[PDB]
Subunit: 295 residues, 4 copies
């Protein structure tokens, strides 16, 4: 037998950082969960019990805190790139670092219509994520994403004209509820190294904001023919607004809300035009994916 692939590191490293503006007194907080996995010339730790090649996962944890102390942690694309580059430059035998960061929302509180200097609220479990792969000799690959954005529209969704055969019971519809949890990823063109990532720093937050805005607007305004057709519209727009993106991927559950026939009870009318009370279904759910790139 032979080691065909190997990677190891530290997962679920929770990190908080505060920035204090001495002039204004305003404080800003960042909280993330970080995972770093390394690859390189480490096969002998598996095959020969040679621990000399192992940078201990505990040390990886220390390095994350030290790096957060000495560098900005925002945008996460930059922090992840710094963190990954560290490992491949510091250790001769480590040739790739894989850094995943999940950013948690701490949104500044408004009290009496003014932003509070040091108090924050978690408004939703929506996340902003990055995956950064730093590979010696092959630059920096960054996939940015948002996830956990849960939305619902109560009308202006349709689904008709699908294939019908002996396995089909679903009725065509011209008015249904559509609800999903959005997972959207945009993949950046490969960067040559940290200097290049640094040069594009302002684009990271801007492109996240654009992705979020396009998602919300398109969902709200499209008279949707299907989840497939609506998601494609979103992806198309994001690619149009940022030329440094190569592909956009969406993965969307179709979280079903079923009509409830109540006609058995006193002829009560609760279907079609008369539908008011629905039963949200926890499972199963549709799952629709697409990756859109440039012609």
């Amino acid at each position: 037998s032979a080691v065909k692939a190997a990677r190891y590191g530290k997962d679920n490293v929770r990190v908080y950082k505060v920035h204090k503006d001495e002039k204004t007194g305003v404080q800003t907080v960042y909280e993330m969960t970080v995972c770093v996995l390394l690859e390189g010339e480490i096969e002998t730790s598996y095959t020969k019990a040679d621990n000399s090649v192992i940078v201990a996962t505990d040390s990886i944890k220390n390095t994350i805190y030290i790096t957060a102390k000495q560098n900005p942690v925002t945008p996460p694309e930059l922090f992840g790139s710094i963190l990954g580059t560290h490992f491949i430059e510091k250790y001769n035998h480590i040739h790739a670092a894989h850094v995943n960061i999940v950013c948690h929302r701490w949104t500044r509180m408004d009290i009496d219509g003014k932003p509070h200097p040091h108090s924050f609220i978690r408004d939703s479990e929506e996340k902003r994520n990055v995956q950064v792969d730093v590979v010696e000799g092959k630059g920096i690959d960054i996939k940015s994403s948002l996830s956990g954005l849960t939305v619902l529209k109560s009308t202006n969704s349709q689904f008709w004209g699908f294939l019908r055969d002996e396995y089909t019971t679903l009725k065509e519809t011209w008015d249904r509820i559509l609800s999903t949890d959005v997972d959207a990823t945009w993949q950046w063109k490969n960067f040559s190294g940290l200097q290049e990532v640094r040069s594009h720093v302002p684009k990271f937050d801007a492109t996240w904001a654009t992705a979020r805005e396009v998602t919300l607007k398109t969902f709200a305004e499209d008279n949707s023919a299907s989840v497939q057709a609506t998601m494609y519209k979103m992806a198309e727009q994001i690619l149009a607004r940022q030329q440094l993106i190569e592909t956009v991927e969406y993965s969307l559950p179709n979280k079903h809300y079923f009509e409830i026939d109540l006609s058995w009870h006193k002829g009560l009318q609760n279907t079609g035009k008369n539908a008011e009370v629905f039963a949200p279904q926890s499972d199963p759910n549709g799952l629709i994916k697409c990756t859109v790139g440039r012609s």
Copy 2:
């Protein structure tokens, strides 16, 4: 042996309702999870296999949907009171209904700075809940609550002057992070029946809003001496603003964020005044509770 207490019913009943304003085209959605448990003269179902006394839990489920179809579902205090009263009036041998409702957030989307007629976002997993106990001959008891409100302040929290003995290692501090998930419950004075609950309908949303506002403002503005002292301030204010409330209960975890000493690494300064990077602790956590009533 003897049956000392018994209750049975249906849990985890997910319900969605939409309201459509025909004049304006605006739609408003409500989504809840409902639990209804009944008590009464039902001992024989346990002791003698006498199912004749059982209103089937499946029927309870049907009744929830039917009741939602024929009545407003907001405020939840009113809906719960209608639902519970139904069971004790319909069935001679059922003498108490216990209704728990969890309300899920569907917040109307703003697109291009205007509120959208039919699109919604789940902004946070914060819930508004009610517990309604309808007891034949003893009126309607309602406990209203908010839960899952997660907040953090980065300074203006202290903790010093606590008891110190041979079990104590905690250092006194004049500046720490304070973060919690707020669970706040206000218990209404007993209501004589549905007519009385109906008479106070506007107070339900108003008091929820007040509880939320007082919680957020006090947390943000109190230079906190402890979780105990800050929570008492919140409870005191709520009782002052609504005379129909008898008690207010808060249950607050103290979600710890620990300093990380980095001095072992190149004398790096990250404690006390120099603390910037912290380690959020998943467990253990402090848990502090209090119930405040009137003198």
Copy 3:
């Protein structure tokens, strides 16, 4: 306003302890999650910011580890009683301790049909729990429980003869699936203090084992007329086998598995006698509770 009730302490304290038999080399592990909440003369911490009355929750955490170091951690009824008694005896102004312990399964591995001296498997998320309330002057109240015991029988469950009215759609049945997660609690007669708890030590594990055995046997062998009737049979037997128990409480979800009509597809027969494939329902679920005591 006035403090009507208050309690505070440390939740989610994870503890592991190992015992090493030097003679045989056999090691035995225990893992628990502990919560300790105190009550007493502590109102001034809430009302006047008087921290002098506060035994810090961090100190409570230390005390749990120290107590585990110096005492047996099994049975949990004994450990909880020691832990709670500590607080009320050590601190003059603390008058009640509330100790909750969840015990996690670490079951010794059998390798090649022999028990391994130091390797363990988590066989299921079933828990053994205790709630111990130690109140100055009022002795020690102990509620023991098992939870998370998930079972299913594929036949020998019935449900017919329930009330039928205009809210009823459920068909009577003489053969259905029954599946539940068992939560069973037995409440001990009040103990005067630690000496008395110590005197009954062997009864704790024995009664847990009996409760578990009676639950499993009755579930498997009863041709069940309802969840109500079957659970009563369980409770009756436990009370008969241990005279130091005052009440037994069961709380049982009815986790529904629905028939799937497939007759629309090529007349395929999958209902009643021909039912083979079913759809497990995640929600809603029935919830049935009962507390049984002595005549």
Copy 4:
């Protein structure tokens, strides 16, 4: 823009099937959660709102139940292969099916030392999974796995001789706790189609059993030099025992249990040789992966 990749289908389809032996009266239950995603000539559903190419996800759900009604559901490798082949043969324009199945444990109860004909217990949340990719013209690729197997050994684990530099604080150790949740996957050689999968049917359960046995024995018996070295030993053995496997992949968290220094309290000795009480750490955790194939 252009569609670069697309797949869609139904996730979280819960399925139960019962088998009844009429001769013996013995019943056997199977419960699974199934996900089916299709690929093929479906781009126009995204780009042109052409639903004619869509086999509705609701129909996919129906097909899963129908297929379960007419075929054995065990071993899951066979069921997944039947299910996937169905889609690529039935629909001209569908060219790949991706089937994921998670199998839930229902273990027959022993009552009074005899196996019960129709009662079952969920002994642990360990799963047996399959991923089956059926691609028109390219046969059937099957990855089988076990997951959620949680184990702990209290001694006979070491970790010393790792790299030490200015980022390192971890002390070398010759005796520590090792605990993990095992995720192990074995990838079968490509199969030409259903006939070939059918021919190897007995190997599927046998190889699952072997993987499980080798995992447990090696974990229990290896005086482990590291997680890396122990996992390699497991993978090597599995490959040796089944020639139709091409690679074995393990992904193992290192779930840390920390010593607790109690010397501050009355000189209490709880570290090194004297360590008895430990603090299980929920996060962070090491994460170690490896893929082993043939020379």
